[PDB]
Amino acid sequence: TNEYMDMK
Amino acid sequence: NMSLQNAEWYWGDISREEVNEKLRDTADGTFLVRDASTKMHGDYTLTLRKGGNNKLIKIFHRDGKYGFSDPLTFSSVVELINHYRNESLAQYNPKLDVKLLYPVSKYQQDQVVKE
């Protein structure tokens, strides 16, 4: 799967 | 310092679907950078392999600076990537205790043999 990471 | 466009791991304008295929069955720490799907929330998308899945990370460019979040303190995408080859991404997100280990290179071409 692809997951967009919260980098904040 | 080298330009983004010649960086082996920069693939420019390829799709999220193409990256999936490039990262299929790869080891943790395998990565490449492409242009963002859309335009209004980050210029580039770093995709890395972790736990058999793909982690997508926006790279921002504002006011002559680059980074993953404010404050942006890197001078180029190359400098940012190079920094995290030897430094874990954990300081941004607990799920990313991993380094940028193995670039998917656009120069690394394998030859299918014809008899």
Side-chain angles (χ1 to χ4, degrees), chain B residues 24-82:
Chain B
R24 190 189 73 262
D25 185 47
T26 61
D28 285 3
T30 308
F31 74 94
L32 70 87
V33 172
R34 65 162 168 80
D35 292 346
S37 293
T38 61
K39 291 292 209 69
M40 315 186 149
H41 198 259
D43 289 13
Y44 309 96
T45 302
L46 163 72
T47 313
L48 61 91
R49 193 71 161 176
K50 180 140 188 308
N53 288 286
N54 304 327
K55 311 299 169 164
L56 289 60
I57 293 147
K58 280 302 175 65
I59 302 174
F60 295 98
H61 179 211
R62 291 179 306 239
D63 201 20
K65 306 139 174 50
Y66 297 88
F68 301 131
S69 60
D70 285 303
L72 309 181
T73 62
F74 294 89
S75 61
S76 71
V77 178
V78 173
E79 183 179 86
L80 174 75
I81 295 312
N82 281 343

Side-chain angles (χ1 to χ4, degrees), chain A residues 1-7, chain B residues 20 53-56 93:
Chain A
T1 66
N2 302 277
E3 184 176 39
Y4 260 108
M5 303 314 278
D6 193 357
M7 296 304 262
Chain B
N20 275 302
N53 288 286
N54 304 327
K55 311 299 169 164
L56 289 60
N93 186 309

